[PDB]
Amino acid sequence: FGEVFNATRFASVYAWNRKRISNCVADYSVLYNSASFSTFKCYGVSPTKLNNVYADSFVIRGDEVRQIAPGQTGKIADYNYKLPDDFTGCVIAWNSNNLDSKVGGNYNYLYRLFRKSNLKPFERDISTEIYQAGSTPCNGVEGFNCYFPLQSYGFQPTNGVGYQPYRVVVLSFEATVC
């Protein structure tokens, strides 16, 4: 658990990591007592009665936290990380403005806003193909009507709460783990 939450550096939204946790002593209530979590919503199971399991880790914006949920529509929910409707797990998120925010602008975190098809649940797209928005083809060269598929989050300490980084850890409960 600590190797996913207390990680030194997280991954981007489109390049969300996936940790297969097997053969473990799971203490699901070891972080519920931690009041450092601002968003904590379980969907497929009651939280207090939890006593393979995957852990998806990425960093999104402040307003994008509402999109990680079944049946949500948005830039992150359709082109970056989509959750199935019959989801069985929990979504944990907390503010990390004091970590992933340089004084001159932390442009290391990216996100995808250009894709010609919505992502399937638990789908990962690391495609750097130049998105064609116009009528004439691009042929791997960017320019007018040929934009880059990824965009950079701002992330500065003077940004609003809605535009601050939030580290999200999505737990998916798919008897090797109890």
Next chain:
Amino acid sequence: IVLTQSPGTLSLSPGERATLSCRASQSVSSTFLAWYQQKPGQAPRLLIYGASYMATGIPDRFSGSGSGTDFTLTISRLEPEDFAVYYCQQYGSSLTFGGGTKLEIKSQVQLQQSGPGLVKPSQTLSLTCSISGDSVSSNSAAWNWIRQSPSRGLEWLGRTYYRSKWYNDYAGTVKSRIAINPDTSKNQFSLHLNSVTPEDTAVYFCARVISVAGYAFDIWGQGTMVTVSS
């Protein structure tokens, strides 16, 4: 796309709120609406990129909002330092600047310009833009040339960038006589205007465009004044 800003002139006192607007003739589908601040005698300063994302060193007072055709720039608490003209820029199917709103109050990468400021008519205008802190052949960058005159405003001229090879993009207004050549050995890129007229008298700028930063001009140059006189 035609960007029409409103109001044209706004006079306020320190402490009040200035609500600026920028209406486009059609929808900016690429969502690359950028806001700039230009204090008198200086180059434009990137405030907001990509509809609402704030730039480097921009206080929380400046806030971007809007999408499609209506865009608003809301400055919460005004200071005497905010006396400047604010512009509106979009990228996508074209590269158009706004008319400008004159608001009156009652960093590691450096682009340095060089070249002559007095060119005779029917002669070539040459200006060089030295780059330090970033590579002129950067894969995620573009090197543009922009001029500013009270008759046309911020008029974008052209650009050059390097992916696998070198590519060009020129504005049809000056395409018949413009040339932008990069120099990798000196880490520069220069501007050439073949046949100049008194209409070309303006203040020219060179700026950097990062693709992941809303395709907005984030770091501008010194700003040289070229006069076409005989």
